[PDB]
Design an enzyme around this catalytic site. Structure first.
Site, PDB file in Angstrom:
ATOM      1  CG  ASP A  37     -22.255 -31.725  15.239  1.00  0.00           C
ATOM      2  OD1 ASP A  37     -21.395 -30.884  14.906  1.00  0.00           O
ATOM      3  OD2 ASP A  37     -23.092 -32.196  14.441  1.00  0.00           O
TER       4      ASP A  37
HETATM    5  O1  LIG Z   1     -21.019 -27.794  18.088  1.00  0.00           O
HETATM    6  P1  LIG Z   1     -21.565 -27.520  19.469  1.00  0.00           P
HETATM    7  O2  LIG Z   1     -20.464 -26.978  20.347  1.00  0.00           O
HETATM    8  O3  LIG Z   1     -22.088 -28.806  20.059  1.00  0.00           O
HETATM    9  O4  LIG Z   1     -22.772 -26.404  19.375  1.00  0.00           O
HETATM   10  C1  LIG Z   1     -24.104 -26.827  19.422  1.00  0.00           C
HETATM   11  C2  LIG Z   1     -24.969 -25.695  18.871  1.00  0.00           C
HETATM   12  C3  LIG Z   1     -24.279 -25.118  17.636  1.00  0.00           C
HETATM   13  C4  LIG Z   1     -26.340 -26.243  18.489  1.00  0.00           C
HETATM   14  C5  LIG Z   1     -25.164 -24.624  19.946  1.00  0.00           C
HETATM   15  O5  LIG Z   1     -24.224 -24.813  20.964  1.00  0.00           O
HETATM   16  C6  LIG Z   1     -25.026 -23.214  19.372  1.00  0.00           C
HETATM   17  O6  LIG Z   1     -24.045 -22.580  19.573  1.00  0.00           O
HETATM   18  N1  LIG Z   1     -26.108 -22.647  18.591  1.00  0.00           N
HETATM   19  C7  LIG Z   1     -26.030 -21.312  18.030  1.00  0.00           C
HETATM   20  C8  LIG Z   1     -27.452 -20.763  17.938  1.00  0.00           C
HETATM   21  C9  LIG Z   1     -28.431 -21.271  18.992  1.00  0.00           C
HETATM   22  O7  LIG Z   1     -28.207 -22.288  19.552  1.00  0.00           O
HETATM   23  N2  LIG Z   1     -29.629 -20.523  19.318  1.00  0.00           N
HETATM   24  C10 LIG Z   1     -30.540 -21.023  20.331  1.00  0.00           C
HETATM   25  C11 LIG Z   1     -31.365 -22.195  19.812  1.00  0.00           C
HETATM   26  S1  LIG Z   1     -32.544 -22.706  21.095  1.00  0.00           S
HETATM   27  C12 LIG Z   1     -33.208 -24.335  20.655  1.00  0.00           C
HETATM   28  O8  LIG Z   1     -32.467 -25.196  20.329  1.00  0.00           O
HETATM   29  C13 LIG Z   1     -34.710 -24.604  20.702  1.00  0.00           C
HETATM   30  C14 LIG Z   1     -35.102 -25.401  21.943  1.00  0.00           C
HETATM   31  C15 LIG Z   1     -36.293 -26.323  21.697  1.00  0.00           C
HETATM   32  C16 LIG Z   1     -36.451 -27.363  22.802  1.00  0.00           C
HETATM   33  C17 LIG Z   1     -37.239 -26.843  24.002  1.00  0.00           C
HETATM   34  C18 LIG Z   1     -37.123 -27.774  25.204  1.00  0.00           C
HETATM   35  C19 LIG Z   1     -38.461 -28.026  25.895  1.00  0.00           C
HETATM   36  C20 LIG Z   1     -38.487 -29.373  26.615  1.00  0.00           C
HETATM   37  C21 LIG Z   1     -39.608 -29.470  27.645  1.00  0.00           C
HETATM   38  C22 LIG Z   1     -39.400 -30.610  28.638  1.00  0.00           C
HETATM   39  C23 LIG Z   1     -39.576 -31.984  27.997  1.00  0.00           C
END
Ligand SMILES: *OP(=O)(O)OCC(C)(C)[C@@H](O)C(=O)NCCC(=O)NCCSC(=O)CCCCCCCCCCC
Ligand SMILES: CCCCCCCCCCCCCCCCCC(=O)OC[C@H](COP(=O)([O-])OCC(O)COP(=O)([O-])OC[C@@H](COC(=O)CCCCCCCCCCCCCCCCC)OC(=O)CCCCCCCCCCCCCCCCC)OC(=O)CCCCCCCCCCCCCCCCC
Ligand SMILES: CCCCCCCCCCCCCCCCC[C@@H](O)O[C@H](CO[C@H](O)CCCCCCCCCCCCCCC)COP(=O)(O)OCC[N+](C)(C)C
Ligand SMILES: CCCCCCCC/C=C\CCCCCCCC(=O)OC[C@H](COP(=O)(O)OCCN)OC(=O)CCCCCCC/C=C\CCCCCCCC
Ligand SMILES: CCCCCCCC/C=C\CCCCCCCC(=O)O[C@H](COC(=O)CCCCCCC/C=C/CCCCCCCC)COP(=O)(O)OCCN
Lengths: 84, 88, 459, 63, 219, 124, 178, 70, 128, 104, 175, 55
Positions: free
Chosen positions: B43
């Protein structure tokens, strides 16, 4: 004069997660249905001469045994020379 | 300093060494030219983690714009060689 | 005094009868010889003066200025040799003639024993400078610059002439010795107030005083390198010398007439220094730093104490040498880059290391690092000002800090960092430029060994 | 050998020059080298004069 | 004014040092807090004690910086303590030198820092001074012990956290000898210098038992 | 500390002020009042040029210790008996200062008790 | 650095950049390797729970609350590689980098040392002189009208050709010249 | 001016016996010095002169009268 | 929910906290594309001038010339006397002078009165 | 200029400027050697409040400790010869009032 | 040394203690001074004797210039320029001499402070008193004259001081 | 005569010789750091003597 001696890498099959805190991390992760894919990349940090640790108090008392023996010898000599 | 002058063979060996410790990919299947998404079925998050492992292994950081388009071990080796000015 | 004046006059026929390819060599050699001869004026007494004749006399205030004037001419010739390569022989001879005439007028002005004679030569110094600025200047602003440099000056000096003749109709003499020995107090009167203003404003405008300084950045950034050197090193000190001479007949009015100028200086030195923090032109920055130093000299002269006068003399000499060196360094960059903008040519320490050392020494001297004579003058002035009022230290202290900042700023922007990539025409420094910097900087560090030579007649 | 020449040219020659300069030029003027007066304790004797400083008042000694 | 300035300086700088991750920053904040302690000593009218502290601090702080630089060079110009792990066994001479230096900095008895820091703490304890400045000095002593602990714990005691290519090397006679001379200094110079100088102040002979042990207790 | 708590949290007038101490005549307690004795004279104490703060009632032991230190130079631990003697004398001086503090405190207690008894007798 | 930038970052690139930043700052918080491994696996699990979501609006509502949560807990002193733009040795060797053209100003007594180097340098100069005249026309005909749309450069397509604008990239000073 | 030590790549680095013995010797020296000084000069830590109890002094030596005289 | 970041003049807003980057419209994409296009054109011009073997001179930058000219010489012709400029000029150029005059005059009057009454103790004050 | 991208290939890498792009009126104010405006982990107002509160609290506590000092339960230090009258300033022709010290 | 007058620059008799070793350990200071003597003082002394004999081979003299007394400003006519010139030169010479007198007293004071050690506050009373008197006299003579000082201004200051003193004396007598 | 002053001035004076030699041939070789280090060690040893005299 420089270090051109053709260092060869160890065998990658040598590094195993068993007997390390990474094993406990893997168990805790499996308790939630997860896995650690990079676990064997860190195993060398707990494998060889790095496998044994020293406490803070043990670090402070690094040369206490030999110093104590020398102090005992010196104080005994001081006693046996003054008492004359 | 006293740093040995790393070579292309050393860079390739270390890259493959780090990749073989990634249990997501089978050590028999991968090669220098084995692609990440298509040849090994990985991925984008896996690619980010692989880049981070490379950065930790070699002690320097790859910028995200360059790192996002490194899809084979061979191009990782080439990028590290171009950055560090490796002759042979 | 004619043993110095006559050879300086003989420089002109020697220049004009010289071969086409030997003007610079002969001019430099004979100017250096005249400087060596003028070195003998430094033997001064603790008594009155070296009264050679009825027309000329020398003092320990005039002797260092005369030595600096005679020493600046060979340096100006060396600095002008480069950019005047493609010029016809007649025009090069005219340039050298202008420089020689300026030196002659300055020499006579410092040693003149009569106030009217002093005024005439003090004004005669204007014509060669104006011709040099408006003829061999590079940009189109030079014309405007020249106009400013002229009219400001004249606007101050026409009243002085009036006052001078008025004084001679009242005391009967304008000879400085008689004027000093027959001095009488000035009563507080409106007529006396305007006489004070007439006697003071001409010298204030040429220091220049803050608020009357607008001509100086124009003139210094538009002049050729020799013009900038002579303007910063010698022509500014004419006002200080004149105020030092003329304040003997202005007491006790100066006790309260000095307040508007003192403030204008004490605040002004802050403003100009802060102006140096945000400047995109090297020459403009160096000119504003000159304004700040001369504001300190104005304060010293207005305080009217022995330590003030000693510090003012020392600071005048030190600033002359330092500002001339800084202008020469900026010009040596300009002749390679042709821009005169600070942030264009960068990281020059990597490409020109010895010139970077010259830059460091010049910046350190402008920063008043002890035991340079710059710091000697500054510290004597500061101590006298503290005795005048303990609050002054605040402003003085602030200036010190600011000065260091902008000085090091100029050193860091041009010498440190990464070189500009597309600038590929930076050639190794010539022996002429290195010798110019060495001949600027060695006299300063030599003078720190015998400061009594530059401490004036009150030492 | 190198240490010998270093000690000769970097220590002995400067100390010779400085000692000559101090002993025959600097001290030729008054108050140039001013020494702190040596401390005098009871029971001492002076080289210049030869008198003996009297002892103290035999304080009662115990512990 | 000198007393209050020194007290606030030493407290604030030790507090800042307690959470730093660059090793050179930790040692620099330690130097600043020690300078604040010197100014506290000046404020209570003990200038010769401040001079003695200057002399002892020279030895042990210079040796601490040399040990830090040895680590930095051995780890490929890496300065963050997050990326240095088990160095107690990997480079033992630097470990012993830094341990002795940290013990001298915290005023371990009969070491070089004892003969200045302990006397300074005693003098501040028994003096007509600010209560706030005294409290801040004691808290700063505790924080000195704390950041010495931080350096040792994060640089020597754990598992390694540096890149796999191990280039650790202490075996250079220049480094060993330069560190060893200041090691001997930081062990014996306090005793020698204190016993070889004339008395320049009235001693604090009699003291409450808890007041005599205050520096050791807070450390 | 306890005296700080007593003065700052309790009654301020109940305890001495260190700056203005003593406030009671030296003869108030008992009329004997033997004088303190000094051993080192002005001249020898000036010749030893100790310090203006070391020029105290223990100065003779300091002079003796300095004589030992100067006399046995290379052996810097030779004369430790006189260091002990000077330290003991300074200890006794500090104990005398503590006794002065205590006496002033108790006299203040007694004076306040006298004032309270007189006020009670006046109110009754 | 080497790659030309685009006009904008897509949603996927922004998500991946957040993932890398969050993992790095979590590593800075968790000093030890096993703790970091555990919490990084937890963060990976938290990150891909919305991996399969389809609509853009809420997927953009996520990665906004994620940025806010990251900025609240971002470890104000994160670990930086020493050569990285915030590291302790970022531009340390910048003062030892000297351009190649400076060698043209060497004295002949200096160029007398190293004759082989300067012969090779002359070969390089003549190669550059021919290749430039070819490259200008190649770039002129390969460019769309109205000017370039992206600062990306083409490769060489003929046999003896060289990539256009190659001199100042190939003749970089070095990473550690002295 | 040292000896040659090659890198190890994920193994404990090579150590010389000289540095080990030197470090152990200097640590032992520090501990022996501390023990020796504590044995010989213990008053530098625990004190030598006892602290008197101010409330334990009798009123006779403090010049206190039984609240009736003056 | 987490405590909000409040931007200021000297601590600006992070790009990841900009709502403007989450309000994507076709017009925004077109603006970004044409901004990249003009940047690419300028980069191509500079790099063509920079890699040329024949050139042996500093490359002239019109933007730098415009900056220096605007900072120095375009000021006065665009100056207009307004209440704001008049008031600021009067304040910043006159107020400090009279403030410092008042301070110094008061100090010197105090010192002169003390000298005249004789209670200043100028012993050892020999150099002035 | 400090908050510009450090991973971009600027024509002037140290200034992070491109040839031909418009220059900010105050470029020399922001040159990475001077005032920068980069976002901080903590908001500006919170930082100002915390720093000012710490400084004010320390000043107030130092004043409080000035009013309530610390000392030991001792009397003043005693000096033999009229409180060292001759050795401290002198004036040996005035016969100062004698101060005698109390032996307890 | 005879190079300066001992009365103008006085010094105490410099009584120094005698070595009274108490232990059998040889002190390194004495041995170091003996080797210093042998290795430094002897060659320097020999070079000095050579240079002194060379100087004795060529002996010649220079003299202190004596200045006659001339009438001062208090006996010059209003516009008699020659008398004012002579009086001004004489006054300037006197001013320089007074400055050097103050310098001599200051040197005495500094030497006393360094020499007396910890008891300088009591043992340097005489030098402090002498400096106080000389400083008071110098301040009365020459303070506040300005940078353009002259004998006429000094005379005016003295005249005003004498007028004030006479007024105060008459007021106190007629109290 | 009284080697104290001569020794104290000699320490500071011999600290300055390598600065004078910084324009000589030693500065262009690789022995200059050892030169400076040896000079400083010699100065320390020399300065140890006035400390003994004061002690
Ligand atoms: O196949 P790839 O090209 O690698 O695609 C990866 C992926 C499919 C996951 C992504 O690029 C994508 O296109 N997703 C589609 C929907 C999407 O991603 N919507 C947003 C989701 S946001 C999320 O992941 C929640 C974040 C939680 C983490 C918060 C961070 C806080 C940390 C604080 C400091 C330590
Ligand atoms: C200190 C004692 C020295 C004693 C030894 C003799 C010293 C001779 C000094 C001569 C005077 C200065 C000469 C300046 C021009 C240099 C020309 C040159 O290019 O040389 C290249 C030459 C060859 O190098 P290179 O390989 O070509 O270099 C390549 C790059 O250019 C790289 O070049 P670089 O990086 O090597 O740059 C040169 C280097 C050095 O270059 C300089 O900085 C020169 C200028 C330094 C001073 C700047 C002005 C400050 C005010 C000084 C006023 C006092 C003057 C005294 C009389 C001077 C008479 C000339 O830069 C610095 O190190 C910074 C210097 C900062 C000094 C700060 C302290 C100054 C005051 C010190 C106290 C002095 C009085 C003490 C009083 C109390 C005790 C008695 O190298 C040198 O010669 C360097 C000389 C070493 C520096 C001397 C500094 C000390 C001397 C100061 C003045 C004289 C003091 C005398 C009393 C001493 C006691
Ligand atoms: C522009 C950049 C700077 C240029 C240089 C500026 C420096 C020149 C400043 C001039 C110095 C001051 C001039 C006069 C000072 C005398 C003191 C007097 O003005 O103050 C009061 C005088 O009161 C009032 O000032 C009366 C005059 C009021 C009218 C004058 C105009 C006021 C402001 C004008 C400023 C314009 C300057 C620029 C001209 C183009 C004192 O009251 P009084 O005791 O009764 O008079 C004492 C004088 N006696 C003894 C002769 C009688
Ligand atoms: C008094 C000073 C008044 C203010 C002076 C303003 C000067 C402006 C010109 C300076 C030039 C700009 C400049 O220096 O750049 C700022 C530069 C960069 O910041 P860094 O954090 O280092 O960033 C590096 C990592 N990126 O920082 C500085 O050096 C500026 C420092 C200014 C300090 C001003 C505050 C001083 C306050 C003093 C109060 C204490 C008084 C004394 C207390 C003692 C009691 C007796
Ligand atoms: C950089 C530009 C500066 C411009 C010059 C500023 C200085 C102006 C000084 C005044 C100008 C005239 C000076 C007069 C010459 C001195 C002669 C003198 O003092 O005689 C006075 C005469 O004094 C005057 O008449 C002066 C009157 C003023 C007329 C000219 C006005 C010029 C402008 C005045 C205001 C500006 C002055 C300060 C400007 C500050 C800088 C901008 C006494 O005359 P009597 O009648 O013989 O004696 C009285 C007893 N019967």
């Amino acid at each position: 004069e420089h270090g051109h001696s053709k260092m060869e890498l160890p065998d990658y099959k040598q590094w195993k997660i068993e007997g390390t805190p990474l094993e406990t991390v893997q168990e805790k992760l499996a308790a939630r249905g997860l896995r650690d894919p990079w676990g064997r990349n860190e195993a060398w940090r707990y494998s060889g001469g790095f496998a044994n640790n020293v406490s803070f108090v043990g670090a402070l008392l690094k040369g206490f045994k030999w110093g104590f023996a020398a102090f005992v010898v010196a104080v005994g000599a001081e006693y046996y020379l003054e008492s004359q | 300093s006293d740093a040995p002058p790393l070579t292309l063979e050393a860079i390739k060996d270390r890259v493959l060494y780090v990749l073989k410790l990634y249990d997501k990919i089978d050590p028999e299947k991968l090669s220098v030219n084995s692609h990440f998404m298509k040849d090994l079925g990985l991925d984008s998050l896996d690619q980010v983690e692989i880049i981070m492992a490379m950065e930790d292994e070699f002690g320097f950081e790859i910028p995200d714009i360059d790192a996002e388009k490194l899809m084979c071990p061979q191009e990782i080796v080439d990028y590290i060689a171009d950055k560090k000015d490796v002759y042979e | 005094m004619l043993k110095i004046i006559i050879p300086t006059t003989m420089l002109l026929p020697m220049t004009w009868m010289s071969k086409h390819n030997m003007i610079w060599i002969n001019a430099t050699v004979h100017s250096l010889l005249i400087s060596l001869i003028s070195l003998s004026l430094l033997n001064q007494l603790g008594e009155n003066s070296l009264n050679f004749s009825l027309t000329f006399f020398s003092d320990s205030l005039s002797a260092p200025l005369l030595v600096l004037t005679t020493w600046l001419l060979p340096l100006m010739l060396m600095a002008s040799q480069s950019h005047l390569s493609k010029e016809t022989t007649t025009r090069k001879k005219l340039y050298i003639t202008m420089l020689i005439l300026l030196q002659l007028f300055l020499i006579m002005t410092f040693t003149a024993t009569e106030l009217i004679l002093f005024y005439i030569l003090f004004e005669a110094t204007l014509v060669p400078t104006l011709i040099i600025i408006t003829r061999w200047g590079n940009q189109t602003e030079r014309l405007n610059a020249g106009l400013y440099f002229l009219f400001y000056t004249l606007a101050g000096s026409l009243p002085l002439l009036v006052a001078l003749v008025y004084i001679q109709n009242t005391t009967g003499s304008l000879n400085f010795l008689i004027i000093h020995y027959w001095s009488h107090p000035l009563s507080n009167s409106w007529s006396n107030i305007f006489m004070w203003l007439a006697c003071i404003m001409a010298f204030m405008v040429k220091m220049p005083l803050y608020g009357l300084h607008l001509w100086l950045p124009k003139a210094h950034v538009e002049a050729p390198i020799a013009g900038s050197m002579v303007l910063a090193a010698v022509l500014l000190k004419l006002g200080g010398y004149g105020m030092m001479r003329i304040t003997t007949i202005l007491n006790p009015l100066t006790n309260y007439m000095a307040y508007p100028f003192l403030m204008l200086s004490m605040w002004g030195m802050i403003m100009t220094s802060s102006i140096c923090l945000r400047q995109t032109d090297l020459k403009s920055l160096i000119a504003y730093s000159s304004v700040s130093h001369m504001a300190l000299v104005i304060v010293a002269i207005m305080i009217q104490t022995p330590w003030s006068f000693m510090g003012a003399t020392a600071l005048m000499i030190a600033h002359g040498l330092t500002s001339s060196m800084l202008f020469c360094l900026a010009n040596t960059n300009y002749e390679r880059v042709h821009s005169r903008t600070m942030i264009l040519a960068r990281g020059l320490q990597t490409l020109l290391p010895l010139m970077a050392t010259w830059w460091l020494v010049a910046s350190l001297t402008n920063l008043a690092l002890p035991p340079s004579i710059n710091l000697i003058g500054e510290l004597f002035i500061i101590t006298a000002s503290f005795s005048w009022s303990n609050i002054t230290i605040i402003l003085m202290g602030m200036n010190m800090m600011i000065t260091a900042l902008y000085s090091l700023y100029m050193l860091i922007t041009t010498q440190r960092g990464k070189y500009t990539h597309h600038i590929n025409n930076i050639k190794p420094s010539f022996t002429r430029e290195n010798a110019l910097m060495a001949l600027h900087i060695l006299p300063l560090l030599l003078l720190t060994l015998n400061p009594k030579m530059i401490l004036g007649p009150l030492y | 050998y190198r240490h010998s020449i270093f000690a000769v040219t970097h220590v002995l020659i400067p100390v010779w020059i400085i000692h000559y300069y101090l002993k025959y030029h600097v001290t030729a003027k008054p108050y140039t080298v001013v020494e702190r007066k040596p401390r005098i304790f009871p029971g001492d004797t002076i080289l210049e004069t030869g008198e003996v400083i009297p002892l103290m008042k035999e304080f009662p000694d115990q512990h | 004014m000198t007393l209050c300035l020194g007290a606030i300086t030493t407290l604030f700088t030790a507090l800042c040092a307690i959470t730093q991750n660059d090793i050179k920053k930790i040692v620099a904040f330690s130097t600043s807090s020690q300078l604040g302690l010197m100014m506290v000593t000046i404020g209570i009218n003990q200038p010769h004690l401040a001079f003695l502290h200057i002399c002892m601090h020279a030895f042990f702080k210079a040796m601490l910086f040399m040990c830090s630089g040895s680590i930095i060079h051995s780890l490929n110009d890496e300065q963050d303590i997050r990326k240095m792990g088990g160095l107690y066994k990997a480079m033992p001479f630097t470990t012993t030198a830094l341990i002795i230096g940290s013990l001298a900095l915290t005023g371990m008895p009969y070491l070089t820092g004892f003969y200045s820091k302990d006397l300074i703490i005693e003098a501040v304890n028994m003096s007509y001074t600010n209560a706030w400045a005294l409290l801040m000095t004691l808290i700063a002593t505790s924080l000195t012990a704390a950041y010495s602990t931080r350096i040792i714990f994060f640089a020597f005691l754990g598992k390694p956290r540096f890149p796999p290519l191990v280039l650790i090397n202490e075996n250079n006679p220049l480094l060993i000898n330069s560190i060893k001379r200041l090691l001997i200094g930081s062990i014996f110079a306090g005793f020698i210098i204190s016993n070889n100088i004339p008395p320049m102040t009235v001693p604090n002979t009699t003291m409450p038992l808890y007041m005599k042990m205050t520096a050791l207790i807070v450390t | 500390g306890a005296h700080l708590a007593r003065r700052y949290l309790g009654d301020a007038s109940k305890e001495p002020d260190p700056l203005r101490m003593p406030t009671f005549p030296p003869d108030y307690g008992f009329p004997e009042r033997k004088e303190r004795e000094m051993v080192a004279t002005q001249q020898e104490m000036n010749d030893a040029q100790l310090m203006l703060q070391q020029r105290d009632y223990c100065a003779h032991y300091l002079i003796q210790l300095l004589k030992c230190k100067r006399d046995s130079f290379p052996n810097f631990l030779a004369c430790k008996h006189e260091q002990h003697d000077w330290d003991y004398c300074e200890h006794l001086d500090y104990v005398k200062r503590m006794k002065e503090f205590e006496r002033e405190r108790r006299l203040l207690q007694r004076k306040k008790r006298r004032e309270q008894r007189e006020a009670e007798m006046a109110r009754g | 650095a080497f790659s030309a930038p685009a006009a904008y970052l897509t949603h996927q690139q922004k998500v991946l950049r957040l993932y890398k930043r969050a993992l790095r700052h979590l590593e800075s918080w968790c000093v030890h390797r096993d703790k970091y491994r555990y919490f990084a696996c937890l963060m990976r699990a938290r990150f891909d729970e919305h991996k399969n979501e389809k609509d853009m609006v809420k997927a953009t509502q996520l990665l906004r609350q994620a940025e806010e949560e990251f900025w609240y807990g971002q470890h104000p002193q994160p670990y930086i590689f020493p050569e990285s733009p915030g590291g302790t040795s970022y531009e340390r060797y910048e003062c030892y980098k000297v351009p190649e053209w400076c060698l043209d100003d060497w004295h002949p007594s200096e160029k007398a040392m190293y004759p082989d180097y300067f012969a090779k340098r002359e070969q390089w100069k003549r190669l550059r002189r021919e290749s430039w005249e070819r490259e200008v026309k190649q770039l002129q005909e390969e460019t769309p009208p109205g000017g370039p749309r992206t600062e990306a450069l083409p490769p060489a397509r003929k046999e003896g050709d060289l990539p256009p604008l190659w001199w100042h990239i190939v003749t970089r000073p070095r990473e550690r010249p002295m | 001016g040292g000896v040659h030590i090659e890198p190890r790549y994920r193994q404990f680095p090579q150590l010389t016996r000289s540095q080990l013995i030197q470090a152990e010797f200097f640590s032992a020296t520090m501990w022996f010095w501390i023990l020796w000084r504590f044995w010989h000069d213990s008053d530098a830590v625990l004190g030598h002169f006892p602290y008197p109890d101010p409330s334990q002094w009798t009123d006779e030596e403090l010049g206190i009268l039984p609240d009736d005289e003056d | 929910s987490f405590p909000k970041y409040k931007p200021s003049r000297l601590a600006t807003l992070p790009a990841t906290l900009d709502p403007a980057e989450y309000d994507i419209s076709p017009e925004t994409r077109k603006a970004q594309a044409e901004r990249l296009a003009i940047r690419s054109r300028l980069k191509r011009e500079y790099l063509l001038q920079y890699n040329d073997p024949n050139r042996l001179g500093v490359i002239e930058d019109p933007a730098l010339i415009r900056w220096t000219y605007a900072r120095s010489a375009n000021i006065y012709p665009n100056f207009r006397p307004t209440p704001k400029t008049s008031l600021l000029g009067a304040l910043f150029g006159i107020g400090p002078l009279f403030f410092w005059y008042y301070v110094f005059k008061t100090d010197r009057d105090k010192k002169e009165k003390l000298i005249q009454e004789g209670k200043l103790d100028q012993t050892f004050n020999i150099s002035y | 200029q400090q908050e510009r991208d450090p991973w971009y290939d600027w024509d002037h890498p140290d200034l992070r400027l491109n040839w031909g792009e418009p220059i900010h009126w105050d470029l020399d104010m922001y040159i990475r050697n001077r005032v920068d405006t980069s976002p901080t982990p903590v908001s500006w107002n919170t930082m100002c409040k915390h720093l000012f509160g710490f400084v004010a609290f320390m000043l107030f506590m130092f004043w409080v400790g000035e009013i309530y000092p610390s000392y030991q339960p001792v009397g003043p230090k005693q000096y033999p010869y009229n409180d060292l009258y001759l050795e401290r300033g002198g004036d040996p022709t005035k016969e100062p009032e004698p101060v005698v010290h109390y032996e307890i | 040394p005879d190079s300066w007058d001992k009365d103008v620059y006085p010094e105490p008799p410099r009584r120094t203690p005698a070595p009274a070793p108490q232990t059998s350990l040889p002190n390194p200071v004495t041995y170091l001074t003996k080797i210093f003597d042998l290795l430094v003082d002897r060659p320097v002394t020999l070079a000095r004797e050579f240079i002194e004999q060379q100087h004795a081979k060529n002996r010649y003299y220079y003299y202190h210039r004596e200045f006659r007394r001339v009438p001062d400003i208090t006996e010059c006519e209003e516009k008699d320029i020659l008398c004012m010139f002579e009086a001004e030169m004489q006054w300037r010479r006197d001013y320089k001499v007074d400055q050097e007198i103050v310098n001599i007293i200051q040197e005495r004071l500094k030497a006393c402070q360094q020499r007396e050690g910890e008891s300088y506050r009591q043992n340097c009373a005489k030098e402090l008193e002498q400096f106080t008197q000389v400083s008071k006299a110098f301040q009365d003579r020459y303070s506040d004259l300005g940078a353009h000082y002259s004998a006429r201004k000094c005379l005016a200051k003295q005249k005003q001081r004498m007028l004030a003193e006479r007024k105060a004396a008459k007021e106190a007598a007629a109290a | 005569m009284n080697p104290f002053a001569s020794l104290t001035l000699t320490t500071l004076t011999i600290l300055t010789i390598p600065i004078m030699m910084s324009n000589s041939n030693i500065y262009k070789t690789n022995l200059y750091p050892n030169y400076v280090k040896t000079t400083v060690s010699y100065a320390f040893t020399l300065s140890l003597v006035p400390l003994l005299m004061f002690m």
